[PDB]
Write an enzyme that holds these catalytic residues in place. Structure first.
Site, PDB file in Angstrom:
ATOM      1  N   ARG A  52     -14.325  54.109 -42.547  1.00  0.00           N
ATOM      2  CA  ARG A  52     -13.236  53.243 -42.105  1.00  0.00           C
ATOM      3  C   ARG A  52     -13.779  51.832 -41.965  1.00  0.00           C
ATOM      4  O   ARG A  52     -13.833  51.290 -40.870  1.00  0.00           O
ATOM      5  CB  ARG A  52     -12.672  53.732 -40.742  1.00  0.00           C
ATOM      6  CG  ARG A  52     -12.042  55.122 -40.683  1.00  0.00           C
ATOM      7  CD  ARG A  52     -11.677  55.482 -39.244  1.00  0.00           C
ATOM      8  NE  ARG A  52     -12.870  55.507 -38.406  1.00  0.00           N
ATOM      9  CZ  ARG A  52     -13.801  56.452 -38.475  1.00  0.00           C
ATOM     10  NH1 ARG A  52     -13.663  57.450 -39.336  1.00  0.00           N
ATOM     11  NH2 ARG A  52     -14.889  56.370 -37.721  1.00  0.00           N
ATOM     12  N   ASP A  63     -19.503  61.487 -37.894  1.00  0.00           N
ATOM     13  CA  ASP A  63     -18.119  61.018 -37.946  1.00  0.00           C
ATOM     14  C   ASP A  63     -16.991  62.057 -37.750  1.00  0.00           C
ATOM     15  O   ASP A  63     -16.205  61.947 -36.808  1.00  0.00           O
ATOM     16  CB  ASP A  63     -17.830  60.240 -39.306  1.00  0.00           C
ATOM     17  CG  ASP A  63     -16.720  59.150 -39.109  1.00  0.00           C
ATOM     18  OD1 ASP A  63     -16.026  58.802 -40.083  1.00  0.00           O
ATOM     19  OD2 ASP A  63     -16.568  58.646 -37.982  1.00  0.00           O
ATOM     20  N   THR A  64     -16.920  63.056 -38.622  1.00  0.00           N
ATOM     21  CA  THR A  64     -15.854  64.050 -38.541  1.00  0.00           C
ATOM     22  C   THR A  64     -15.650  64.767 -37.218  1.00  0.00           C
ATOM     23  O   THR A  64     -14.576  64.667 -36.629  1.00  0.00           O
ATOM     24  CB  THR A  64     -15.993  65.119 -39.640  1.00  0.00           C
ATOM     25  OG1 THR A  64     -17.360  65.531 -39.671  1.00  0.00           O
ATOM     26  CG2 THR A  64     -15.566  64.596 -41.038  1.00  0.00           C
ATOM     27  N   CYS A  89     -17.293  72.258 -47.046  1.00  0.00           N
ATOM     28  CA  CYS A  89     -18.157  71.746 -45.986  1.00  0.00           C
ATOM     29  C   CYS A  89     -19.299  72.681 -45.568  1.00  0.00           C
ATOM     30  O   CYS A  89     -19.092  73.861 -45.298  1.00  0.00           O
ATOM     31  CB  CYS A  89     -17.339  71.436 -44.737  1.00  0.00           C
ATOM     32  SG  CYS A  89     -18.307  70.726 -43.386  1.00  0.00           S
ATOM     33  N   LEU A  90     -20.508  72.141 -45.508  1.00  0.00           N
ATOM     34  CA  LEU A  90     -21.659  72.940 -45.121  1.00  0.00           C
ATOM     35  C   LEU A  90     -21.810  72.984 -43.619  1.00  0.00           C
ATOM     36  O   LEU A  90     -22.377  73.924 -43.076  1.00  0.00           O
ATOM     37  CB  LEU A  90     -22.936  72.365 -45.755  1.00  0.00           C
ATOM     38  CG  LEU A  90     -23.063  72.599 -47.284  1.00  0.00           C
ATOM     39  CD1 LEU A  90     -24.246  71.815 -47.885  1.00  0.00           C
ATOM     40  CD2 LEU A  90     -23.245  74.105 -47.497  1.00  0.00           C
ATOM     41  N   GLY A  91     -21.291  71.968 -42.938  1.00  0.00           N
ATOM     42  CA  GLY A  91     -21.416  71.922 -41.493  1.00  0.00           C
ATOM     43  C   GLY A  91     -20.228  72.467 -40.728  1.00  0.00           C
ATOM     44  O   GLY A  91     -20.109  72.246 -39.525  1.00  0.00           O
TER      45      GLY A  91
HETATM   46  C1  HEM Z   1     -14.360  68.661 -38.049  1.00  0.00           C
HETATM   47  C2  HEM Z   1     -15.597  68.584 -38.795  1.00  0.00           C
HETATM   48  C3  HEM Z   1     -15.788  68.514 -40.181  1.00  0.00           C
HETATM   49  C4  HEM Z   1     -14.861  68.401 -41.192  1.00  0.00           C
HETATM   50  C5  HEM Z   1     -13.346  68.375 -41.062  1.00  0.00           C
HETATM   51  C6  HEM Z   1     -15.596  68.345 -42.461  1.00  0.00           C
HETATM   52  C7  HEM Z   1     -15.019  68.254 -43.746  1.00  0.00           C
HETATM   53  C8  HEM Z   1     -15.696  68.203 -44.963  1.00  0.00           C
HETATM   54  C9  HEM Z   1     -15.098  68.167 -46.296  1.00  0.00           C
HETATM   55  C10 HEM Z   1     -13.626  68.063 -46.618  1.00  0.00           C
HETATM   56  C11 HEM Z   1     -16.109  68.220 -47.212  1.00  0.00           C
HETATM   57  C12 HEM Z   1     -16.016  68.169 -48.748  1.00  0.00           C
HETATM   58  C13 HEM Z   1     -15.680  66.811 -49.369  1.00  0.00           C
HETATM   59  C14 HEM Z   1     -15.667  66.854 -50.903  1.00  0.00           C
HETATM   60  O1  HEM Z   1     -15.403  67.940 -51.452  1.00  0.00           O
HETATM   61  O2  HEM Z   1     -15.900  65.804 -51.549  1.00  0.00           O
HETATM   62  C15 HEM Z   1     -17.334  68.294 -46.444  1.00  0.00           C
HETATM   63  C16 HEM Z   1     -18.594  68.335 -46.996  1.00  0.00           C
HETATM   64  C17 HEM Z   1     -19.807  68.364 -46.338  1.00  0.00           C
HETATM   65  N1  HEM Z   1     -19.925  68.368 -44.968  1.00  0.00           N
HETATM   66 FE1  HEM Z   1     -18.396  68.368 -43.637  1.00  0.00          FE
HETATM   67  N2  HEM Z   1     -16.963  68.426 -42.229  1.00  0.00           N
HETATM   68  C18 HEM Z   1     -17.096  68.543 -40.846  1.00  0.00           C
HETATM   69  C19 HEM Z   1     -18.321  68.625 -40.181  1.00  0.00           C
HETATM   70  C20 HEM Z   1     -19.583  68.538 -40.751  1.00  0.00           C
HETATM   71  C21 HEM Z   1     -20.808  68.509 -40.018  1.00  0.00           C
HETATM   72  C22 HEM Z   1     -20.980  68.751 -38.520  1.00  0.00           C
HETATM   73  C23 HEM Z   1     -21.802  68.343 -40.912  1.00  0.00           C
HETATM   74  C24 HEM Z   1     -23.142  68.353 -40.575  1.00  0.00           C
HETATM   75  C25 HEM Z   1     -24.052  67.255 -40.800  1.00  0.00           C
HETATM   76  C26 HEM Z   1     -21.182  68.317 -42.220  1.00  0.00           C
HETATM   77  C27 HEM Z   1     -21.846  68.299 -43.451  1.00  0.00           C
HETATM   78  C28 HEM Z   1     -21.275  68.358 -44.722  1.00  0.00           C
HETATM   79  C29 HEM Z   1     -22.021  68.384 -45.985  1.00  0.00           C
HETATM   80  C30 HEM Z   1     -23.540  68.410 -46.150  1.00  0.00           C
HETATM   81  C31 HEM Z   1     -21.097  68.377 -46.992  1.00  0.00           C
HETATM   82  C32 HEM Z   1     -21.314  68.296 -48.507  1.00  0.00           C
HETATM   83  C33 HEM Z   1     -21.215  69.622 -49.242  1.00  0.00           C
HETATM   84  C34 HEM Z   1     -21.171  69.452 -50.779  1.00  0.00           C
HETATM   85  O3  HEM Z   1     -20.874  68.332 -51.244  1.00  0.00           O
HETATM   86  O4  HEM Z   1     -21.425  70.447 -51.498  1.00  0.00           O
HETATM   87  N3  HEM Z   1     -19.829  68.425 -42.099  1.00  0.00           N
HETATM   88  N4  HEM Z   1     -17.081  68.277 -45.082  1.00  0.00           N
HETATM   89  C1  LIG Z   2     -15.844  63.299 -47.130  1.00  0.00           C
HETATM   90  C2  LIG Z   2     -16.958  63.698 -46.163  1.00  0.00           C
HETATM   91  C3  LIG Z   2     -16.352  64.208 -44.822  1.00  0.00           C
HETATM   92  C4  LIG Z   2     -17.955  64.650 -46.864  1.00  0.00           C
HETATM   93  C5  LIG Z   2     -19.193  64.679 -45.936  1.00  0.00           C
HETATM   94  C6  LIG Z   2     -19.082  63.377 -45.137  1.00  0.00           C
HETATM   95  C7  LIG Z   2     -18.015  62.602 -45.989  1.00  0.00           C
HETATM   96  C8  LIG Z   2     -17.465  61.312 -45.346  1.00  0.00           C
HETATM   97  C9  LIG Z   2     -18.666  62.418 -47.362  1.00  0.00           C
HETATM   98  O1  LIG Z   2     -19.128  61.386 -47.851  1.00  0.00           O
HETATM   99  C10 LIG Z   2     -18.650  63.799 -48.010  1.00  0.00           C
HETATM  100  C1  LIG Z   3     -18.490  66.596 -43.336  1.00  0.00           C
HETATM  101  N1  LIG Z   3     -18.440  65.422 -42.441  1.00  0.00           N
END
Ligand code: HEM
Ligand SMILES: CC1(C)[C@@H]2CC[C@@]1(C)C(=O)C2
Ligand SMILES: [C-]#N
Length: 404
Positions: free
Chosen positions: A176, A241-242, A347-349
């Site tokens: 943002r 952030d998320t 999402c991995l997290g």
């Molecule tokens: C409410 C919490 C969260 C939401 C809604 C969320 C949502 C997402 C979404 C939509 C993606 C895929 C985006 C795409 O396909 O381009 C993603 C990817 C990812 N998220 Fe999250 N996330 C959350 C929390 C976290 C946390 C706590 C971490 C930990 C550091 C994390 C790590 C990642 C990683 C490493 C990916 C990349 C996976 C890949 O590209 O194969 N996320 N997340």
């Molecule tokens: C779209 C996302 C939530 C996903 C992990 C963090 C994020 C902002 C990215 O750049 C990939």
């Molecule tokens: C996935 N932030």
């Protein structure tokens, strides 16, 4: 508004601004929901932010994330330049190349890790909430939403908390942007921060997330410093952030809905279910993909190089997926959504996310069962790659709380 491409038909033009939606005052999800009104097409084109397509229904959003042969993650962000500067791993990669790096990241934030962090997650939540309890008020975004998931991540990453102000500022400009820095600059600054750390952790391998990444192997061979930086960079944005923003959306809702608070207080075992329903209703992410060649999607001619926003936030808000979508029902039978993405980039997290969410809800309602939005306050949301809550002033009567 940018010049309308030759191949884009006039009727599909719906000028939605993802970083400043028109009905934002009604709530960020509601602002995006306009794309799903009766007249709006399934796939429309917005001349805003350089110009890009926007799939507005879950069926198209899901299909696009599944077909990585046409919708590539190479350029996942809008505007174009941000999407072009974006080289985080494994998100800027498509299968099969993506798979090897994704396995390594899964090793540092996956469920096994959530298990190791169980105690610290629990301890931090209770500690922060207990400190706030007697006060009868708080600025939720600053006092809990940010510090709880960010301190847990910095702990995992083995990074000093004194670095939070800098890193949070940079991550925020990527999702943002306030204008002061471009995505590319924010990305470079984040990488600059990490370079020396990664080098030290490759000389003296440790147990933290950065060391595990930097000293790791990708399907048999040594990861490079460049690859490590690109993977760690993504992890920081993910951890800062998320969850931070989602927590505020959920607490805002609970602060405004006495009956939903009652339900979880009476039946705590429903919290996991409530978590899932809240994730659908308060979904907050929206990135996208880029066309690898000319392709006709759902009757609409898409051109190679064209960008398409596939709002993960929209799928769950789609009435064709969930009846009475804007309503929160913890007993909803089939909670459908793409809050954590769809396809090979899921999402991995998410597991760390749900744990933090569920723990927050359980420990908060345990000590501060009753609370409301501060008198006369008007909650403001923000929109972008990751939408969020500007500020959330809450209040409660200390006399109704309990220390555990
Ligand atoms: C409410 C919490 C969260 C939401 C809604 C969320 C949502 C997402 C979404 C939509 C993606 C895929 C985006 C795409 O396909 O381009 C993603 C990817 C990812 N998220 Fe999250 N996330 C959350 C929390 C976290 C946390 C706590 C971490 C930990 C550091 C994390 C790590 C990642 C990683 C490493 C990916 C990349 C996976 C890949 O590209 O194969 N996320 N997340
Ligand atoms: C779209 C996302 C939530 C996903 C992990 C963090 C994020 C902002 C990215 O750049 C990939
Ligand atoms: C996935 N932030």
């Amino acid at each position: 508004l940018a010049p309308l491409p030759p191949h884009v038909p006039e009727h599909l033009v719906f000028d939605f601004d993802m970083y400043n939606p028109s009905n934002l005052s009604a709530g960020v999800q509601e602002a995006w929901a306009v794309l799903q009104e009766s007249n709006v097409p399934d796939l429309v084109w917005t001349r805003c932010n350089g110009g890009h397509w926007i799939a507005t229904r879950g069926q198209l959003i899901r299909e696009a994330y599944e077909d990585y042969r046409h919708f590539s993650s190479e350029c996942p962000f809008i505007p174009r330049e941000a999407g072009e500067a974006y080289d985080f791993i494994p998100t800027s990669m498509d299968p099969p190349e993506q798979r090897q790096f994704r396995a390594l990241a899964n090793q540092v934030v996956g469920m096994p890790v959530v298990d190791k962090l169980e105690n610290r997650i629990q301890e931090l939540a209770c500690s922060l909430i207990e400190s706030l309890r007697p006060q009868g008020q708080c600025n939720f975004t600053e006092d809990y939403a940010e510090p709880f998931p960010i301190r847990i991540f910095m702990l995992l990453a083995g990074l000093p908390e004194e670095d939070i102000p800098h890193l949070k500022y940079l991550t925020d400009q990527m999702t943002r942007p306030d204008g002061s820095m471009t995505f590319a600059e924010a990305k470079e600054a984040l990488y600059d921060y990490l370079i020396p750390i990664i080098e030290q952790r490759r000389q003296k391998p440790g147990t933290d997330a950065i060391s595990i990444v930097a000293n790791g192997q990708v399907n048999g061979r040594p990861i490079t410093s460049d690859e490590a930086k690109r993977m760690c960079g993504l992890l920081l944005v993910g951890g800062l952030d998320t969850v931070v923003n989602f927590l505020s959306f959920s607490m805002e809702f609970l602060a405004k809905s006495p009956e939903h608070r009652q339900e979880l207080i009476q039946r705590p075992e429903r919290i996991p279910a409530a978590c899932e329903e809240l994730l659908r209703r308060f979904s907050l992410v929206a990135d996208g993909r880029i066309l690898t060649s000319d392709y006709e999607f759902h009757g609409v001619q898409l051109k190679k190089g064209d960008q398409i926003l596939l709002p993960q936030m929209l799928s769950g808000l789609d009435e064709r997926e969930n009846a009475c979508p804007m309503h929160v029902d913890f007993s909803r039978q089939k909670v459908s959504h793409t809050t954590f993405g769809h396809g090979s980039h899921l999402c991995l997290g998410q597991h760390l996310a749900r744990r933090e969410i569920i723990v927050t809800l359980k420990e908060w309602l345990t000590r501060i069962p009753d609370f409301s939005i501060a008198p006369g306050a008007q909650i403001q949301h923000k929109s972008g790659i990751v939408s969020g809550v500007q500020a959330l002033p809450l209040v409660w009567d200390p006399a109704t709380t309990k220390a555990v």
